[PDB]
Amino acid sequence: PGVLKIVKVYLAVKRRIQPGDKMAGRHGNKGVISKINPVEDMPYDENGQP
Amino acid sequence: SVTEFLKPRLVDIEQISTTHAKVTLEPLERGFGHTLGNALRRILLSSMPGCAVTEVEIEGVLHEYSTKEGVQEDILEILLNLKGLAVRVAEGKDEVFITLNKSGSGPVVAGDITHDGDVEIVNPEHVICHLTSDNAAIAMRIKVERGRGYVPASARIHERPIGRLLVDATFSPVDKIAYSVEAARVEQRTDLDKLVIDMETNGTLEPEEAIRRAATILAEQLDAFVDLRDV
Amino acid sequence: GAEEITADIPNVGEAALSKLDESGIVYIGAEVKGGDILVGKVTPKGETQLTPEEKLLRAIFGEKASDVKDTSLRVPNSVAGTVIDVQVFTRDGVEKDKR
């Protein structure tokens, strides 16, 4: 009672992963992302795969 | 001598596959192999120019989070597949437009894209979509832009009609870089080294051109080191 | 009075109405950011006893006050997305808008 019209809007947001987001495995090893490192700065193997 | 070094030169470009290659630099002093290898690996993996899909327009589609009749994959999946499209744009052009009009049943691949001759598709077998009905038709207009680095849709500066779907662009064509320093069989000297750089790319950027561009960038910054004056 | 959903929002220009339709509801597929109007709604308001300097401003610059205030649905701050669906629910006996 008392309402004449209702308008409902659905908004879709694509949320990317950023520092501060909480990431975890399946063994209780939770964590918070501290840095999004550049590719060239991360450890890599002999074949070159970082 | 102990003052004049040996200038490295390009030796052999081995092209194992369309997306994989090896570049040999020889000769190199003791310790210069790793220095140049790490500098070139860091430059190649960071700032190589390349062409990527930026915006798409599909008929009958208003937003990414929607479907289309006769199309097995959602529009978001089609955009994610378009991100993995390798295209080479002829020099002098920054923005180009290509068209994908296909009707029938089967896999819509990158070989059905019509181009004006200034754009060459590297992977014609890339599966873009699947059409599951005989009456299904797809009509897309794709914008390809030249850039450097990674520019997401949000970072783009802001009229835009409803229907223009912005796509995150990874302009860098280099995927994996490895390098090894081995012994070099020189005529007289035996303390010389050879640098082998293995480059896995999308096929857009040639190995020799990539090496010269990385060397050029390093040379430009080392020039500001060479002068070394207060500004 | 009766609160109305309409595009004739006072004190708002044209750029903010670019994404609104004739009824006053944004289209499907519109990219909106924080502060953008989604549903244009006007609310009847009572008389305001405006301060002396305010009536100076009104006398000099014109701009007579309207009978409706802007109480419109705006996108929350730091939220930017795509409108994917709009549902309109109307009470029985009320004129169903175009949308």
Closest in B42, B63, B179 to A40, CB measured:
B42
Q: Name the method of structure determination.
A: cryo-EM
Gap from C3 CA to chain B (nearest CA, Å): 30
Per-residue CA distances from C3 to A3, B176, C46, C68 (Å)? 9, 61, 13, 9
Q: How far apart are CA B139 and CA B134, in angstroms?
A: 15
Which string of DSSP letters, residue by residue, matches B40-77? HHHHHHH--EEEEEEEEEETT--SSS---TTBSS-HHH
DSSP E strands, chain B: 9-14, 20-28, 49-58, 87-89, 95-103, 106-109, 119-121, 127-131, 137-148, 150-151, 164-166, 169-170, 174-183, 193-201
Residue C56 exposure: Cα atoms within 13 Å on the Cβ side? 3
Q: Is the peptide bond before A43 cis (omega within 30 degrees of 0)?
A: no
Q: How far apart are CA A49 and CA A1, in angstroms?
A: 64
A15-18: Cβ within 8 A, 24+ apart: A16/B152
Are B46 and A16 inside 8 Å of each other by CB?
Answer: no
Closest CA to B169 of B9, B51, B36, B20: B51
**If you measure CA to CA, which chain C residue comes closest to B61?**
C29
Give the 3-state secondary structure of chain C: CCCEECCCCCCCCCHHHCCECCCCEECCCCEECCCCEEECEEEECCCCCCCHHHHHHHHHHCCCCCCEEECCEECCCCCCEEEEEEEEEECCCCCCCCC
Question: Exposed/middle/buried for B180, CB within 10 Å: 0-12, 13-18, 19+?
Answer: middle
Q: Residue B178: beta bridge partners?
A: B198
Per-residue CA distances from B218 to B42, B79, B206, B215 (Å)? 10, 35, 18, 5
Where does B55-149 have alpha helices with state H? Answer: 75-83
Q: How far apart are CA B17 and CA A3, in angstroms?
A: 68
Gap from A13 CA to chain C (nearest CA, Å): 5
Q: How far apart are CA C58 and CA C53, in angstroms?
A: 9
Resolution of the PDB structure in angstroms: 3.1
Are C84 and A3 inside 8 Å of each other by CB?
Answer: no
Gap from A14 CA to chain B (nearest CA, Å): 10
Q: How far apart are CA B17 and CA B176, in angstroms?
A: 14
Question: Exposed/middle/buried for A40, CB within 10 Å: 0-12, 13-18, 19+?
Answer: middle
With vertex at residue B136, the alpha carbon angle to CA B132 and CA B138, rounded to the nearest 5 degrees, is 110
Question: Exposed/middle/buried for C74, CB within 10 Å: 0-12, 13-18, 19+?
Answer: middle
> What does the DSSP 8-state code read for residue A41?
G
Question: By a Cβ cutoff of 8 Å, what residues of chain B touch chain A?
Answer: 41-42, 45-46, 63-65, 152, 176-179, 198, 200
Are B198 and A48 inside 8 Å of each other by CB?
Answer: yes
Closest in B63, B154, B159 to C29, CB measured:
B63
Structural contact between residues C86 and A22, judged by C-beta atoms closer than 8 angstroms: no
Other residues' Cβ atoms within 10 Å of the Cβ of residue B173:
23
Structural contact between residues B5 and B29, judged by C-beta atoms closer than 8 angstroms: yes
- Residues of C with Cβ-Cβ distance to B65 under 8 angstroms: 82, 84
Q: How far apart are CA B171 and CA A38, in angstroms?
A: 15
Amino acid making up residue B84 = G
Closest CA to B46 of B166, B171, B231, B227: B171
Q: How far apart are CA B40 and CA B208, in angstroms?
A: 12
**B136 in the Ramachandran plot: left (φ > 0), alpha (ψ -120 to 50) or beta?**
beta
